[PDB]
């Protein structure tokens, strides 16, 4: 057994056990492990699922705490809001560390090793996703900065995805889902959001009509969002 | 607002956010906070729900990893088992710290402050529960020791519960559920387990027949177990 082999297995154990932080760590070793070559599809997916689950938990907590803050804030209960926001800060702190860790990994190892359209779009998308999560809770110039990095990353991913991957590709399809969610939720531009989602959903139907549980699911998400946003 | 007040609110926020470790911490402050008086019902319940969720996660991970170890162990795959058990140890380590933290809290503050049958049984039950979780993964003399502490604790809780709380009391009902699960799962004595569960379930039906979503649920659990164990 090899060290890389070990960590990947360990990662999959972590996943089964649902200790995502440890899954992240294992996949992070594997990543920093090799240099010239890039992560396999399985590995690349384990690394993102790991992070997705680590960030996801804080994101859900953030939302919960956030809506609670909103309600107490509107009831004038100023002592409750102070405790909620103090708690929120703690959560926004972990969100920041999490995004930082993966964003560093992306620029240092991940992106520089992308040897194909598949991985380049996968990694550039990730870059956009994590700056997007930062933008979700920031406000001042911090938000602008994160929103800008997000846009830059997604555009870069789209250029490649648009010319190198099939419209039915799940990575390209997910890039569209997230890119349009970005326009709707961070840039509050439902128009640019629906266009993008629509075009992507359409191009996929076309190709599917002329020429995976994977892509099918992502497309369902695009519909749920096209629907929802039309209201 | 008081420090105790703050931590309790914070704890409830932690619960909503599902960051149980932090919920435990907050309730632990509150606990070590007062001295003469004891935790309110709400507080006492928040403290146990906190721990329950913290220990529960490791317990579920442990089980997952454990069954995986079993399967690879039976396929002779000795390299996989070594990695699984190494991972398992890590989990058994957190289980131990978690049980230790709450068990110390029980002997130092919690139990010494129980001023009624309600709390004495609640805390003695907890004591039994956490030694039981230790017994779940131990084997040598470690298991014996934990199994013994469990039995001692549950018996002590039962004596009080049996004479001071109604058969329909959820704490007494839960003490029966756990005490009988202890006989079935740790002492591998389905007979002593079914008797206890049965008697408790019966005494509750009687009292309910002659003289809460709370007790109703616990009793359903007792049935599911009486049923299941009769197979
Ligand atoms: C078992 C765990 C691992 C190894 C992580 O695999 C999970 C999943 O990994 C793959 O799916 C990816 C994938 C996901 C799919 C949307 C899930 O599809 C279904 C129906 O299971 C979820 C993950 O987050 C993941 C890896 C991520 C992305 C995401 C990339 O951001 C940078 C946007 C697109 C999407 C792509 C990469 C999907 O291909 C597979 O195509 C999935 O479907 C199949 C064939 O069963 C499998 O369930
Ligand atoms: C909202 C969170 C808190 C404050 C923790 O309350 C959760 C719950 O807290 C109370 O329920 C307790 C209780 C639980 C009940 C079995 C849940 O009942 C239902 C239908 O919601 C779950 C918890 O683990 C807790 C606190 C624990 C125990 C356990 C004690 O071990 C030492 C064995 C018996 C049981 C007792 C103490 C139950 O009374 C209430 O009676 C519950 O039911 C009502 C009236 O809605 C409420 O949902």
Swiss-Prot record, chains A, B:
InterPro entries: 14-3-3 (IPR000308), 14-3-3_CS (IPR023409), 14-3-3_dom_sf (IPR036815), 14-3-3_domain (IPR023410)
Domain of life according to the entry: Eukaryota
GO biological process: protein localization; signal transduction
The family this protein is said to belong to: Belongs to the 14-3-3 family.
Residue intervals passing through the bilayer: none
Recorded GO CC terms: cytoplasm
CDD domains: 14-3-3_plant
Organism in which the protein naturally occurs: Nicotiana tabacum (Common tobacco)
Protein name: 14-3-3-like protein C
Coiled-coil ranges per UniProt: none
